[PDB]
Amino acid sequence: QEQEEVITVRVQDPRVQNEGSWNSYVDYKIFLHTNSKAFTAKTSCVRRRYREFVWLRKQLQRNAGLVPVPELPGTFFGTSDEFIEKRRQGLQHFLEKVLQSVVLLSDSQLHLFLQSQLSVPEIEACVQGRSTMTVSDAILRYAMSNCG
Ligand SMILES: [Cl-]
Ligand SMILES: [Cl-]
Ligand SMILES: [Cl-]
Ligand code: NA
Ligand code: NA
Ligand code: NA
Ligand code: NA
């Protein structure tokens, strides 16, 4: 009934950023609560857009060996709100599956995606050792800030 380690994830609250402009896009709130020793922060709240998930999947596959990486949601014939809701569902399912794998949970790019608001280029730099702070400090600083 009660597992030793639980990781709960929710993708929620899609929002249009820069609405009406060239740089308009939808992002998604990602909430996480866990007691997993793989994680630095017990709770986190970040926002990520679809192209960032696309990046994340590719990166996970790079390091995953033979552990299969879950597929993302991808024509669509409904309204934009209906498309966004289907996508939101698919992103939630993607992350649930990813979080079942001890191998995928060992990837620091995942942790910075979920528990920091570093940009993709920042995450890449951080895990390549080119940033001024460690993966842990990026995640702790975000936690201790009130940004989520
Ligand atoms: Cl929530
Ligand atoms: Cl971590
Ligand atoms: Cl899949
Ligand atoms: Na969109
Ligand atoms: Na520990
Ligand atoms: Na930081
Ligand atoms: Na701090």
Swiss-Prot record:
Key words, A-Z: Cell membrane, Cytoplasm, Endosome, Lipid-binding, Membrane, Protein transport, Transport
UniProt GO MF annotations: phosphatidylinositol phosphate binding
GO biological process: intracellular protein transport; vesicle organization
Membrane topology: Peripheral membrane protein
GO CC annotations, alphabetized: cytoplasm; endosome; plasma membrane
UniProt keyword Cytoplasm, yes or no: yes
Region Important for membrane trafficking: start-end pairs: 123-127
Keyword Protein transport set for record: yes
Domain PX: 6-120
Subcellular location(s) of the protein: Cell membrane; Endosome; Cytoplasm
Amino acids binding a 1,2-diacyl-sn-glycero-3-phospho-(1D-myo-inositol-3-phosphate): 49, 87
Domain notes: The PX domain mediates interaction with membranes enriched in phosphatidylinositol 3-phosphate.
Subunit structure: Monomer. Interacts with TRPV3; this interaction promotes TRPV3 trafficking from the cell membrane to lysosome for degradation.
Physiological role: Phosphoinositide-binding protein involved in protein sorting and membrane trafficking in endosomes. Regulates the levels of TRPV3 by promoting its trafficking from the cell membrane to lysosome for degradation.
Family: Belongs to the sorting nexin family.
Protein name: Sorting nexin-11
Gene: SNX11
Residues of the full protein shown: 11 to 160 of 270
